[PDB]
Structures are given as C-alpha cells and as structure tokens.
Design an enzyme around this catalytic site. Sequence first.
Site, PDB file in Angstrom:
ATOM      1  N   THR B  59       0.774  -1.175  -0.076  1.00 24.95           N
ATOM      2  CA  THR B  59      -0.054   0.001   0.019  1.00 24.95           C
ATOM      3  C   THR B  59       0.804   1.252  -0.101  1.00 24.95           C
ATOM      4  O   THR B  59       0.800   2.134  -0.740  1.00 24.95           O
ATOM      5  CB  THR B  59      -0.996   0.062   1.266  1.00 24.95           C
ATOM      6  OG1 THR B  59      -2.181  -1.012   1.135  1.00 24.95           O
ATOM      7  CG2 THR B  59      -1.639   1.271   1.147  1.00 24.95           C
ATOM      8  N   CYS B  60       1.841   1.385   0.946  1.00 26.68           N
ATOM      9  CA  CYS B  60       2.614   2.198   1.024  1.00 26.68           C
ATOM     10  C   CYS B  60       3.493   2.538  -0.486  1.00 26.68           C
ATOM     11  O   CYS B  60       3.771   3.646  -0.932  1.00 26.68           O
ATOM     12  CB  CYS B  60       3.699   2.265   2.024  1.00 26.68           C
ATOM     13  SG  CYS B  60       3.048   2.413   3.960  1.00 26.68           S
ATOM     14  N   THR B  61       4.229   1.319  -0.857  1.00 27.33           N
ATOM     15  CA  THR B  61       4.957   1.596  -2.078  1.00 27.33           C
ATOM     16  C   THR B  61       4.177   1.696  -3.240  1.00 27.33           C
ATOM     17  O   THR B  61       4.796   2.583  -3.936  1.00 27.33           O
ATOM     18  CB  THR B  61       5.634   0.025  -2.198  1.00 27.33           C
ATOM     19  OG1 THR B  61       6.285  -0.167  -0.968  1.00 27.33           O
ATOM     20  CG2 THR B  61       6.665   0.044  -3.378  1.00 27.33           C
ATOM     21  N   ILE B  65       3.514   6.544  -0.974  1.00 31.70           N
ATOM     22  CA  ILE B  65       4.926   7.402  -1.210  1.00 31.70           C
ATOM     23  C   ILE B  65       5.224   7.676  -2.678  1.00 31.70           C
ATOM     24  O   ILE B  65       5.985   8.854  -2.755  1.00 31.70           O
ATOM     25  CB  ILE B  65       6.024   6.604  -0.387  1.00 31.70           C
ATOM     26  CG1 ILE B  65       5.775   6.275   1.010  1.00 31.70           C
ATOM     27  CG2 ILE B  65       7.422   7.307  -0.549  1.00 31.70           C
ATOM     28  CD1 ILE B  65       5.451   7.562   1.779  1.00 31.70           C
TER      29      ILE B  65
END
EC number: 1.11.1.24
Lengths: 174, 174, 104, 104
Positions: B59-61, B65
């Site tokens: 999700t972050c990747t 970000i």
Amino acid sequence: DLVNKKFPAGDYKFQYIAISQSDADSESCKMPQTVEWSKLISENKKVIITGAPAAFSPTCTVSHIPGYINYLDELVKEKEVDQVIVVTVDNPFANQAWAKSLGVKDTTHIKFASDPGCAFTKSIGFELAVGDGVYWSGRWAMVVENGIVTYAAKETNPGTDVTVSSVESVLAHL
Amino acid sequence: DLVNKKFPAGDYKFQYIAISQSDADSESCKMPQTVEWSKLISENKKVIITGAPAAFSPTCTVSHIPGYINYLDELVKEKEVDQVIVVTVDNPFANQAWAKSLGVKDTTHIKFASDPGCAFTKSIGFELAVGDGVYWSGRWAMVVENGIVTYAAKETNPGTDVTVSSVESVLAHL
Amino acid sequence: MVTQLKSASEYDSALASGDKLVVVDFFATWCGPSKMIAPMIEKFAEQYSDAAFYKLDVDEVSDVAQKAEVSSMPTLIFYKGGKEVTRVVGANPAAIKQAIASNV
Amino acid sequence: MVTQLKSASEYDSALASGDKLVVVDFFATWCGPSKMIAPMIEKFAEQYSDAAFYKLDVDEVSDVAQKAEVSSMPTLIFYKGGKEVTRVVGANPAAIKQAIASNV
C-alpha cells in the site's frame, strides 16, 4: 547454554513472505505468513538459523548473508539441510525485498523471518541492545537436528565480526 | 489536536542515510546520521512529514509514497517546501534502500527517517498498534510552517485508506 | 606506515602527538572505496613522512566516528594540535594529496 | 454481479446461503493481477448464474483472509454448505473457469 538441549521454540512465531521462481519474471502479490517456531522444527529434521541486526545494513549485506545464499544448494543437496532461516526484527516486506536484492529466487529452503519486538531472539539471549529499550537481533548462527540444538554461537562484537555466525562455521558443524 | 500549536519536537531524534546524485552511478559508503527534530524545524521554514507503517509494504509502495516523489520538484520549486520527511520505524538502511527503489536520487529536500521504537510517532498519537507492545507508524501527514503545525491528519483505517495522508491533501493545505 | 587506531584512547593519544600534521582515514571493511584508497594512503604516508598517518574502522570505534560526524567513507580528517584543519570525503587521491601537501 | 464482502458477518452470511456454489475473490487494491482478473470474474458470474460470486479486500477484512490462509492474490476459494471444496491461486482464467464448471 542451548547446545545439546531441545530447541526452545515455546509459543514463539515469525512472519515471512514467500518467493517462487514465477516471481522476478511475472507480477505477484504475496502477503506475510505466520509460522510457529515449534511447527518449523517438528516438520524439518535439519534447520539452520542465522540472526542479522538489520536488513540492508552493509556488514550483513556484504559479509554475512551472501555466504548462506552462495552455499544454499550445497547445504540442501550435499548436507541435507531442510530450512535456512535468516532472522531480523525488520518488517516482513523489508526482509523479502532484502532477500530478492540478494538473489533469493525461491523460499522453499530459505526464509527471511521477522521476529517482531525481537521476542524470540531476546528469549535465547542473542539480542543486540540499540538503546532506550529497542533491540535488534545480534549476529548469530544455530543448527537444530531432530529438534535438538547441536550448534549455537553469537558474535561478541557484531559491529566488526562474522566468525562464529558465518556459513563456513555452520558448514563445519554439519 | 496539534493544528495551530508549536511543533512538539521535544528531544525527539531520527536517523536517515543521505543519497546524492553521485550514487546509483558510482559506489558510495554512507552511514546513518542523527537529526534532532528541533533542529530540522528551526533550520527549515516549510516541512512536510508523512508517516508510513512499513518500508516496502505494498500500500505504502504503490499508493502513498510515490505521490510525494512525483510532486517533490513541484513542492520545492512552486510551494517553497524545504524538507519532505517520510517517517517509519524501520532501520535506516532499509528506509534508504526503499527510497532508492522508489527513484529518490537526492536527499537534499526528501529524507526517509527512522523513528526508533516509534517514540516520536507515539508521542503525537499517530502510531499503529501491531500487537504485544509493538508499534509501527500509522499513515499520516503533517505540515509545519515556521515551527507551527498548520496541518496534521492520521488515517483511521491505514489498511485501506490513503486520503487525508496523501500528497494531494497536503498540496491543498500549502 | 598507516597505523590502525583500535580504541578512543589510541585516537586521543594520536591526536595529542601535537605540532605536526595528523591524518586519520575513517574506513569500513565492507566499503569498496575504502579498500581502494588504502594502498594510495600508504604511498602518501611514505612520501610525506613529516605527518603521522592513521586509519580507524568506523564500525570498531563508532563513538569516535560519530563525534567526528563521519557519515561517508572514505573520510580523511586532517588534525593539528589535536584540532581539525580540514577533511576530504571520498576516494579522491588528488584532493587528499593536495590536502596533505598544503597542511604538512 | 460480484458482491464485495466488507466485514466478517457479510462473509459468514454469504457462506451460509448454503447448497449452491459460493465463490470468493480475495484481492488487494495495490495488486495488478487482482485488477486484471476482476472483469474476468464478472463475466464468469454472468455466465454461471447457478453460483454466487463475491470479492473481499484482504486489507479491509484481514481476519477472514488470514483464517482462509490467503498468502497470495488473487485467490479464489470455492465453498459448498459453508465449507471449502477447492481454491485457485493466481490470475489464471482457464483454471478458475474449470474450477467453477466442475463445482457449480
């Protein structure tokens, strides 16, 4: 000292993310799996465990984990090793990316394990205190044969030393 | 609530590893640096901070970000942002590798910060409890202008949501 | 010719030799550029015998490296009367040579 | 035609519909293969109307995904009388189609 005693698995668990040959060729969506240390050791007659302070840290990346990947085929085929477990306190996504950056294509016989809160590693006294109640894994190696610890050693100076924890030392006790 | 109050830096610190244009072209040997939150905010008039549960997590990747990297030039050149700080509890080597895997070539205006033990992130109530006393960062964003918090928001459901923490929401408050 | 400093006390004693130029190569065993500059530093040491040359493993004596704010290897720091005059960052032979020549 | 299950109770109620085939697509919003199989599953749902089709976001209902031991997305699990008959892992249209056809 752990040597010649039963592996103290207790109720300790770890997380890892699988890698298969299909990956790094196709797109995959793998999630963390939880493994009870007790099940890993009862299902696997010959288990090598090595501790690493930090995924992507240079000493670990350059001078320690590559040896286990380099010897993996030999450990499995010649020395009948069922599992090589690389233990860090890092999140399982970070550990999996580290394994792939190091050339791991298949987690069948090698798994990069997350020990959350360093709970298992502290339990066997192999932790590295990094300040204000934060613990990383020290650098260490262990051999477990039929659920009995035959080899256990921690680096005194993990900043400089890959000696008793090296794959070479492990090979000498197989 | 933190908005319209002084940034509560206290004695909190973070670790990051620098990246320069010379890297990913040449071989470099960078080490962690310690930054006092108080110094970062007093030396920098306009600071964006975003929290991420885990380096390399999908999700972050995929969904969080990349937006900050995509808008970085715009934030600096058009909106006069001095620093973008991506905060995780991950080790600084893992965070630096994550930044490079995401295309960060230069840490002059963007730094991937390690908040060891989640101490700073817990202090502002933006943590994510992941069980048995282990805390990761939640997913959140904050804007600090002349040492005053102008914008602060945490995802209620960090498993699914990149809303109030997105670079787009941040752009709306600059 | 280049003496490894293996503790803070060794580093402190080396910097306290006083008056003449003291050079310290901050290196790491895992660091390719460290391993490349090393023979270069040995040859600069044989040349500029009016200065004392040392190396320190940042992973072995991390407290000294951190206080010296070494964030990159190689870092050569140049000291006079126990105090830094200049430092050169990176495997930059000509820059290191120039830093010795104008400080010896 | 493919109904998103947004809670454990929804998932439990769907599996308790009973007798006929229940199919659940375990997907993730960040997952490319998920986004590719999705229209494929909709067209299988229109075809095999004798079965009930559902999707569940593993990041939204992680307790149900973990108990079902979903470690990879897509995973389609096939249920009869609230109990798993078979599962297909990966964006494998033909394999999913065959699993429906011989279980409907």
